[PDB]
Structures are given as C-alpha cells and as structure tokens.
Amino acid sequence: EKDIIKMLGLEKAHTPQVHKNIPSVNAKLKVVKHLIRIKPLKLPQGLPAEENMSNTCLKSTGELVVQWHLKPVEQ
C-alpha cells in the first residue's frame, strides 16, 4: 500500500491529484481505497484553454472553474 500511494502521487495528505478514470488506474485505486477519497472532476465551463490556463481554481465541490475573479457575484 505504501508503494502504490507513492505511484499515485499521494505522498502529501489533503492534496488533490487528478488521475484518468481507466481500469488500470482504478486497479491501483482499489488497493488503497481505504486510504483516499475519490471524487469526479467536474468541468462546468469545459476544459481550460491556453488563454485561461493561469486563471483556474479547483473548488471543494470538485468543479474546476476557468475564471477566478475573487469578486462578489453581482447577481
């Protein structure tokens, strides 16, 4: 289990890592399923583009937003 945690880049706790949802990866995740939390990455505004690469933020809901204004919502 120690070895697989290193392979998945999960050495530091509470640090989200993105992995492909494929059988091979899932096979590793299942060995250490009791040590981790798995959530789906959600893309409400689609994938980041080259223009907005630097303005992304991963929220606690799992949604990766491509605009991060740090402003209140006028709505």
């Binding site: 740090l70 209140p72 919502v73």
Partner: protein, 99 residues
C-alpha cells in the same frame, strides 16, 4: 531543548487562553462558546479567537454586538430546521457568493 519545544506549547496555551476568555465573555451574554464561534462563521465573519478575546476586553460594546449577531443567526438556524422548506432564508443567513 526546553526552550525549543516550548514554542509549540506557547501557541497551544495562547489559544487555550483565548477560548477561556471568549467563553467568559459569551456567558455574560447568555451564549455558550460553541454557539458564538459556530454561528459567527455562518455569517461569514472570519474574526479569529485572538481578536475575539481582545475585543471582549477592550471593545465590550462591539463584542455584545457580535454576541447578538451570533444569537440572531442561531435563532434563524432553528426556524429553518423547524420549517419544511416553505420559509425563505433568514435575512442574516444569506451567504455572499464569490466567483
């Protein structure tokens, strides 16, 4: 070695002191410590315990207002929990969103 390890205890003890002082101030207004800290967070007031303890000593009128605000938010929680969703959100329960 003692001086080195004492740096951990200083931070720990400092925070135990603030909680004791905040608890005392809250009880003067009929509020328990967890109700004040918990409900202030729900109002998006991010004042830390160090500042709260200082306010209790040197800004007692502001602290009563903070205690009143926490108490108001606490009562709104109860009304919401009692309701079946018919009621609109409390005036002080509305959360300011940041996008």
């Amino acid at each position: 070695v003692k001086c080195t390890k004492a740096r951990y205890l200083k931070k720990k003890n400092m925070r135990t002191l603030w909680i004791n002082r905040i608890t005392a101030a809250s009880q003067e207004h009929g509020l328990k410590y967890p109700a004040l800290i918990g409900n202030l967070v729900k109002c998006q007031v991010e004042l830390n315990r160090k500042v709260l303890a200082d306010l209790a000593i040197y800004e007692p009128k502001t602290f009563k207002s903070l205690a009143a605000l926490a108490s108001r938010r606490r009562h709104e929680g109860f009304a919401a929990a009692l309701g079946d969703g018919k009621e609109p959100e409390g005036i002080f329960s509305r959360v300011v969103q940041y996008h």
